[PDB]
Amino acid sequence: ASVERIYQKKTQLEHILLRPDTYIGSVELVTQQMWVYDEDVGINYREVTFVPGLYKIFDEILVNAADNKQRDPKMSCIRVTIDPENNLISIWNNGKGIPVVEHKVEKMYVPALIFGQLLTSSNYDDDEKKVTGGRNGYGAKLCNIFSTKFTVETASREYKKMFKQTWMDNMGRAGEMELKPFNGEDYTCITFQPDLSKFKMQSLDKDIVALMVRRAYDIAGSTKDVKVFLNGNKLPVKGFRSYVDMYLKDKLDETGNSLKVIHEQVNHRWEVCLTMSEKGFQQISFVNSIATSKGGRHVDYVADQIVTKLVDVVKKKNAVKAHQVKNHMWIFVNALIENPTFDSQTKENMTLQPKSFGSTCQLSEKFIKAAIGCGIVESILNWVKF
Amino acid sequence: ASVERIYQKKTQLEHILLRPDTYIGSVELVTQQMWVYDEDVGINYREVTFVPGLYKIFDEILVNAADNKQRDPKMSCIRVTIDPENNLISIWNNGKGIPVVEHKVEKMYVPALIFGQLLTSSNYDDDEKKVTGGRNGYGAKLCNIFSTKFTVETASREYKKMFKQTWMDNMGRAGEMELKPFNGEDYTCITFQPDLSKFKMQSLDKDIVALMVRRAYDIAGSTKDVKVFLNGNKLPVKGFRSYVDMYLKDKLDETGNSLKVIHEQVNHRWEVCLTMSEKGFQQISFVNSIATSKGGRHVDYVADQIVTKLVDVVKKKNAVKAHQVKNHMWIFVNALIENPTFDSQTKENMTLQPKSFGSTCQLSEKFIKAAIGCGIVESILNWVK
Ligand SMILES: Nc1ncnc2c1ncn2[C@@H]1O[C@H](COP(=O)(O)OP(=O)(O)NP(=O)(O)O)[C@@H](O)[C@H]1O
Ligand SMILES: Nc1ncnc2c1ncn2[C@@H]1O[C@H](COP(=O)(O)OP(=O)(O)NP(=O)(O)O)[C@@H](O)[C@H]1O
Ligand SMILES: CCCc1cc(=O)oc2c(C(=O)N3CCCc4ccccc43)c(OCCO)ccc12
Ligand SMILES: CCCc1cc(=O)oc2c(C(=O)N3CCCc4ccccc43)c(OCCO)ccc12
Ligand SMILES: [Cl-]
Ligand SMILES: [Cl-]
Ligand SMILES: [Mg+2]
Ligand SMILES: [Mg+2]
Known part of the structure; x- marks a missing residue:
């Protein structure tokens, strides 16, 4: 129980092998x-x-x-x-x-x-x-x-x-x-x-x-x-659209209907696909070809546009909350972000604020109109009817 | 555009100030x-x-x-x-x-x-x-x-x-x-x-x-x-229970009833409080007094026990998924974990597998029964019907 055994200093290489997690x-x-x-x-x-x-x-x-x-x-x-x-x-x-x-x-x-x-x-x-x-x-x-x-x-x-x-x-x-x-x-x-x-x-x-x-x-x-x-x-x-298809091809909801898929290549730095999810909110996203498996502000930036617009539609009819709308979404985002920041070296969560992205991603009025009709609004209105 | 300007080496101290995020x-x-x-x-x-x-x-x-x-x-x-x-x-x-x-x-x-x-x-x-x-x-x-x-x-x-x-x-x-x-x-x-x-x-x-x-x-x-x-x-x-009360303060759900709180100090290393959430799944947790604001396997270890039991009940009276049960839960966990691991230095997500925890946290059948009697099962049984 000596001082030199208790208090230790590690080299950079030693620390990486001893504490690999971060x-x-x-x-x-x-x-x-x-x-x-x-x-x-x-x-x-x-x-x-x-x-x-x-x-x-x-x-x-x-x-x-x-x-x-x-x-x-x-x-x-x-x-x-x-x-x-x-x-x-x-x-x-x-x-x-x-x-x-x-x-x-x-x-x-x-x-x-x-x-x-x-x-x-x-x-x-x-x-x-x-x-x-x-x-x-x-x-x-x-x-x-x-x-x-x-x-x-x-x-x-x-x-x-x-x-x-x-x-x-x-x-x-x-x-x-x-x-x-x-x-x-x-x-x-x-x-x-x-x-x-x-x-x-x-x-x-x-x-x-x-x-x-x-x-x-x-x-x-x-x-x-x-x-x-x-x-x-x-x-x-x-292209990103053909890659996303490999996930959705021949997928069906529980009722037996084919999943309706909304797609838009917003610009040369943003491409977004949206379908419906039956297991809560799902996201598959990439920042500069990094798989951001914990998401990040690029995913929130795209998903929050859809959620707010879909909430405005359920408010005209019918009390609904954004998390209830979000749990019906399965979104795909491929983004190019300038000098992104992340929580860790593994780069699974992209933390850079949208105002520093170096680009924007305003979904077209066509995309939004196709998203109000993808059945998410229907699956919310039938819940309020109960 | 010289080689020495493009490719640079940083000391540990320089790197921390240049790249503070991780x-x-x-x-x-x-x-x-x-x-x-x-x-x-x-x-x-x-x-x-x-x-x-x-x-x-x-x-x-x-x-x-x-x-x-x-x-x-x-x-x-x-x-x-x-x-x-x-x-x-x-x-x-x-x-x-x-x-x-x-x-x-x-x-x-x-x-x-x-x-x-x-x-x-x-x-x-x-x-x-x-x-x-x-x-x-x-x-x-x-x-x-x-x-x-x-x-x-x-x-x-x-x-x-x-x-x-x-x-x-x-x-x-x-x-x-x-x-x-x-x-x-x-x-x-x-x-x-x-x-x-x-x-x-x-x-x-x-x-x-x-x-x-x-x-x-x-x-x-x-x-x-x-x-x-x-x-x-x-x-x-x-104590942890009085701390959790400072959050709920007998406040009411959307219907107007006071929030029901289920509590058990399972052992000297685990203390859990469960109430109702109206904004999706909420967790407030601590590992070795670290605020694990992104959660971790200590939260899953406790919450999934509740979810599995609540799913078992709705099937007897009938198609249910675990996330629908979880989105009605607001859980508080104070845990002591042996040599935990995290995603980053900020220690917001505790990644250690339960088999290395150094202890167990098996909820009592009274706690489970008290969780069976909250509106979570009731709010789900009418939805599947
Ligand atoms: N395939 C490659 N072709 C050309 N240059 C490369 C290649 N791989 C790595 N490099 C260079 O080598 C450097 C070191 O790579 P790396 O250790 O991965 O650091 P980094 O990519 O710059 N940052 P990070 O991966 O986030 O730790 C890079 O910055 C590039 O300049
Ligand atoms: N208030 C304190 N009282 C006694 N010992 C302390 C105190 N603060 C720090 N130490 C000691 O100083 C060491 C260095 O602290 P620190 O740089 O925070 O590293 P760490 O706590 O061991 N690990 P981490 O915080 O995850 O990077 C600790 O390991 C303790 O042994
Ligand atoms: C510790 C491993 C982290 C990780 C890396 C990875 O590479 O993949 C993952 C996927 C995954 O398989 N995918 C598909 C394609 C690339 C991607 C970006 C974001 C999120 C998820 C995913 C995933 O799946 C969860 C259920 O969906 C969950 C985690 C990962
Ligand atoms: C980048 C800052 C991370 C962070 C640190 C922190 O210290 O707190 C947080 C809380 C929070 O306020 N709390 C309450 C008490 C301690 C705790 C443990 C786990 C999770 C959350 C919290 C929070 O709120 C989310 C909505 O609930 C969200 C994030 C934090
Ligand atoms: Cl990360
Ligand atoms: Cl972390
Ligand atoms: Mg690299
Ligand atoms: Mg410390």
Whole structure:
């Protein structure tokens, strides 16, 4: 019971491994209903058992790839490989690579700096209003820390060089840096073997693969002008509306009627789909291709427009409250937000106030008119009649 | 557009001030309905405008004081002072002080280590199953980083010394360490001036004071055997049940009947109150005296017991879903959880699975039967019909 045993100081790396929850989410098993992509079945809603932290280190690299489309509009493809037997995940993107040159301040090559050193980012200057998902300078290093092997390969024609270096043992050591002359099409490829012992797992089982695959479909549905491949197979997704259809296709309410779906691409930064829900308020949303599974002010900003307008209709007739109207809604929101803020590194809840979004999302009078007639008002009027 | 301007590395301290959101919450104004204690009406539900990050650095020090009751059960009092004119907040507790001695490993005095160095804590050894709120070793340093002046004073009789040192300019520099002989009642007092420029605030206005005051009432209601004083005024709270009453005050539902309250202190680590909600599912919960404003598995663990039993009854008299039963519930939970986990440093959502709680909270059949007899089952049986 000595003072030095009671009061302890931890390094940054030690703290991440000792307290992973605020960095990557829970490292313990979770059992809950999720949307997944099952082989031969597609998008479906079922109970899944998985470790959030493992899902998240995959997500960090995948979002980083999508971020490059904002950095370089010439980027066109993301290629994802998932090899459960060899415990191997690879994420590849074209467009401009990372500059392969020595950082004059930190005195090391840039790819080694931003992948092997904590708190390193190109998103630290918020005078630039960016719609990338990267914000904090942790993501890629967290995947590195929770991998037994983590390899960065990036090629920059501008610098006429290609970079390749491997980290091992939870970013505890690095292999040899490979520099080669390069004069081809730029690319970046991140290949890592997740440290499954950190997650009390033995392999990338059916459930986590089904989640990682559905996440690849998310990227295909949330980005623009980006082809997404999964294990060499192109994913058949064209726009957010076709992605949303994969959830609603052939769904029926309890009475037997097909779900009425209201859609509007409000502008180049907002796309909204609205249908009816029988299990309370449901939302599926994305901010800068991040799956905001706890929602955020972008979801409230869209849903509160619909709720207030629907409440005004029930008030002409018939005492109703907004939460009663909201529990009949299932909304899909794909948004591009400038310099978003979140509650945590996992970025599941987007906290930025609408006045700082950098854009607006006023639903058309056509959308609202289609929403007053989607049966939500009918399901509220029959309740007041009781 | 040079490489060194594009790709930058930040120190831990720089990152906290540059990206405060994951550390303390939003540093921008928020307008939402909150429970506050106003100087003329008391506990009431109204719209408030405040900066979460400023509220949180107050919460970090306040929860630290409550943690000391777990460290030293002989501790009995917390005294909080809020002086808006001089921008001065102090949080004082009795019980055992911090050991005043040089840390043999980090080579500095213990209070200077755990208040002036990031990632320093007594809660890093999870072989000890503790029910304190502190987990990550950030809290006090974050308040320090977001203050223009931050002073730590703690007196340890065991070491017969008293410690006092001041940090200034967002923990950018530290004053002189003052060591004096001590032989009185142990205490710890944290006094800080919040850096209102970091929060774009001109003063500690009515709304942020009302929030800080209600939080002191939370501590008085969530802890055991702790008197809480605010500006020399004792808070009249004795136990969790009396605290919950301050919210309901015999107020009436939409029909005009007084709200029926079902209560059970299941054991020494769980106390639950259940009434009726007319605005959807409401929860007011605490884990190790932390206000878990986003809920967590401690709330699900309690609420789902009620939901499962109420669903079992409506099926006997008949298609029902769990969310419809839950949207009529307003639940209060005061829980002590071993080594809890949360989504973020703000600890608003408690993520630990029930199998790691260190205790159980199985509601008595009397409590369940008392829940079967509220209007929740009645308001649902007629709807399915
Ligand atoms: N696929 C990629 N192509 C090009 N640059 C990349 C790629 N992935 C990462 N980077 C760069 O590497 C930096 C570090 O990535 P990362 O550690 O994820 O931090 P971040 O994305 O900026 N912020 P965050 O993910 O919120 O912690 C990024 O800021 C980019 O500049
Ligand atoms: N009022 C107090 N009385 C006694 N010890 C205290 C007091 N406040 C803080 N401490 C000690 O100082 C340490 C540092 O506090 P803090 O920075 O808040 O980290 P923490 O409470 O351990 N975890 P967290 O608050 O979740 O980041 C605590 O672990 C306690 O051991
Ligand atoms: C700890 C994991 C957090 C998470 C990540 C994720 O990736 O997905 C999730 C989904 C989900 O499967 N989806 C579908 C597509 C992407 C998305 C954005 C927002 C909300 C939900 C979802 C979900 O489902 C709840 C029932 O609906 C619940 C949670 C998640
Ligand atoms: C960013 C601020 C987070 C927060 C801190 C806090 O301190 O309070 C809150 C309350 C609140 O006022 N209370 C009452 C007492 C303590 C508590 C525990 C859990 C939940 C809620 C609350 C609240 O209200 C929601 C509508 O009810 C909503 C949020 C908070
Ligand atoms: Cl978040
Ligand atoms: Cl949290
Ligand atoms: Mg990133
Ligand atoms: Mg603390």
